[PDB]
């Protein structure tokens, strides 16, 4: 499978990786500039960026999941709070403007993960 | 297939899309806020961003190709110049301190597409 990857920010490498490996994303490659965190079919490529403000962090990527209730119940049960103010933070599955439903995930760095439900997905905006 | 996607900037929608549909990435979805440009398995999600400087554009994504010679010969033959100063621009397949070889692709917006030749641990997600 020929594949297009999201390239995302990490300030310290054990600090960013331990949040994602609780959510199933295992450490398949690690050097010092680049870190690939991968849950089965879901590849996330995290580059070393210690000069980062989490408020100015323009880095989003969608997780296109065949159920959305498994991975959102996983986030609440492992230890990630549902909150308007905070980082890390999560927001619930909603209805909006195209065909089905979407939710949200933010990490310790400021990375905007958009969570969906597969075709089935159709994610009203 | 469950899949993690790169979310990328587009100023005008026919202006960004016509560059990528020359490179095989057909218009599978289009509304007004979001535009999905996809070469088979290679999904690129382009959101509407007209307040963009191309010099300050921090948006990279890797195309993981099992041959790199087809898609770099495609860029030179369809009409994309190999140049140090310019946008759109391309840079050649150079040898890398990690595995194999990586070339560059920049569009009219300022989107950094990292063109990888894949190695012996080909972990298909
Ligand atoms: Cu936002
Ligand atoms: Cu650079």
Curated annotation (Swiss-Prot), chains A, B:
Pfam entry (one): Glyoxalase
Keywords: Antibiotic resistance, Transposable element
One GO BP: response to antibiotic
Function statement: Binding protein with a strong affinity to the bleomycin family of antibiotics. Binds to CL990; an antimitotic-antibiotic compound.
Family stated for the protein in its record: Belongs to the bleomycin resistance protein family.
Misc: This enzyme is encoded by the kanamycin and neomycin resistance transposon Tn5.
Identification of the protein by name: Bleomycin resistance protein
Gene it is expressed from: ble
Stretches of the chain forming a coiled coil according to its record: none
The keyword Repeat appears for this protein: no
Stretches assigned to the VOC domain: 1-118
Taxonomic superkingdom: Bacteria
């Amino acid at each position: 499978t020929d594949q297009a990857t999201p390239n995302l920010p990490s300030r310290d490498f054990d600090s960013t990786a331990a949040f994602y490996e609780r959510l199933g994303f295992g450490i398949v490659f690690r050097d010092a500039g680049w870190m690939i965190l991968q849950r089965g079919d879901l590849m996330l490529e995290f580059f070393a960026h210690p000069g980062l403000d989490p408020l100015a962090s323009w880095f989003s990527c969608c997780l296109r999941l065949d159920d959305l209730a498994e991975f959102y119940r996983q986030c609440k049960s492992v230890g990630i709070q549902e909150t308007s103010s905070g980082y890390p933070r999560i927001h619930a599955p909603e209805l909006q403007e195209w065909g089905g439903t979407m939710a949200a995930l933010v990490d310790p760095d400021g990375t905007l993960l958009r969570l969906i439900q597969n075709e089935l997905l159709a994610g009203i905006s």
